[PDB]
Design a protein around this ligand. Structure first.
Ligand code: 0WF
Ligand code: MG
Ligand code: ZN
Length: 328
């Protein structure tokens, strides 16, 4: 709705507004547009101002991060954009600037962007079972998450990419420790442990307690990481096919190499519907339910689409079941 046409990398006022909501269609944008979106988030959240981030360094850093994301069906730059856009949406929805310091917002945003850097498209179970260079390097302790972390700090060590160059050493150490904790917390093998620890703190939550806040930040990055089903159906649905494509690539390789195959990755056992019913019911809904205890606004905005999505996949399952009996 402007007097002239502006290039794609110059975000329209409408795009800037839409970016604050979890309804934002992540599929409409090319890498350069998503890069402009992330850059806007840093300026808009006051991170550029409060951490004296050089605006050109912010751009070079984001471009370098983008280049270090592999062209995987799911674990790609668009996924990191989803996680960072969901984190940004949660800052506004949950009024996180009232509860968190600017350093904490910086940690949450930087970890969301960096969390899946240089992902090979084969999970930790593959790395460990196949005894890969990564599993050997990390001694089977979250090999991928440790690698995403190392790559993040390797990018940040390059002077033209150092968005933390004007932050005192004590501030850097604080941000570094926080980012490591958050990226490592994304390992789904640790889900039950992190959920139990958070629920334990949820008995009498304290925003002044550093340990309570560390666990809340861990839950926040975890929420954003697996948040696809929270998005509108049309935006959410294509991500499942992307992930199954990655899961099938791994399970085929494991079968060929004689390694164990996870049933949720097996082409002969998995369907888009059955995989999502379980994940929404037993992972997504319980996690957002605990967040709702601190942030009641999460129920209407995030649990509601999850309830709808669960109900839609249950309808699709009945169709798949009717279809699969004719297959034999
Ligand atoms: C396909 C399903 C699944 N997995 C997802 C989603 C988002 N992130 N992830 C994973 C990417 C790497 C970490 C998490 C998602 O929407 N569905 N998968 C999960 C499995 O289903 C279950 C079911 C119950 C409990 C745990 C996993 C089939
Ligand atoms: Mg990951
Ligand atoms: Zn991820």
């Amino acid at each position: 709705g402007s007097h002239m046409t502006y290039p794609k990398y110059l975000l329209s006022p409408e795009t800037i507004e839409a970016l604050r909501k979890p309804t934002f269609d992540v599929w409409l944008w090319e890498p350069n547009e998503m890069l402009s979106c992330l850059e806007h988030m840093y300026h808009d959240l006051g991170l550029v101002r409060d951490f004296s981030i050089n605006p050109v360094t912010l751009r070079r850093w984001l471009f370098c991060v983008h280049d270090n994301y592999r062209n995987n069906p799911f674990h790609n730059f668009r996924h990191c954009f989803c996680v960072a856009q969901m984190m940004y949406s949660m800052v506004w929805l949950c009024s996180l600037q009232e509860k968190f310091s600017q350093t904490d917002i910086l940690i949450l945003m930087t970890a969301a962007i960096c969390h899946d850097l240089d992902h090979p498209g084969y999970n930790n179970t593959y790395q460990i079972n196949a005894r890969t260079e990564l599993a050997v390097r990390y001694n089977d302790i979250s090999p991928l998450e440790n690698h995403h972390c190392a790559v993040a700090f390797q990018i940040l060590a390059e002077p033209e990419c150092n968005i933390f160059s004007n932050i005192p050493p004590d501030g850097f150490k604080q941000i570094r420790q926080g980012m490591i904790t958050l990226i490592l917390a994304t390992d789904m093998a640790r889900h039950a442990e992190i959920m139990d620890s958070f629920k334990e703190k949820m008995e009498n939550f304290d925003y002044s307690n550093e340990e309570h806040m560390t666990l809340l930040k861990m839950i926040l990055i975890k929420c954003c990481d697996i948040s696809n089903e929270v998005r509108p159906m049309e935006v959410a649905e294509p991500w499942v096919d992307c992930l199954l494509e990655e899961y099938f690539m791994q399970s085929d390789r494991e079968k060929s190499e004689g390694l164990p195959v996870a049933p949720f990755m097996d082409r002969d056992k998995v369907t888009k519907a059955t995989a999502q019913i379980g994940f929404i019911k037993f992972v997504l809904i319980p996690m957002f339910e605990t967040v709702t205890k601190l942030f009641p606004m999460v129920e209407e905005i995030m649990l509601q689409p999850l309830w709808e999505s669960r109900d839609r996949y249950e309808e699709l399952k009945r169709i798949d079941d009717a279809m699969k009996e004719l297959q034999k």
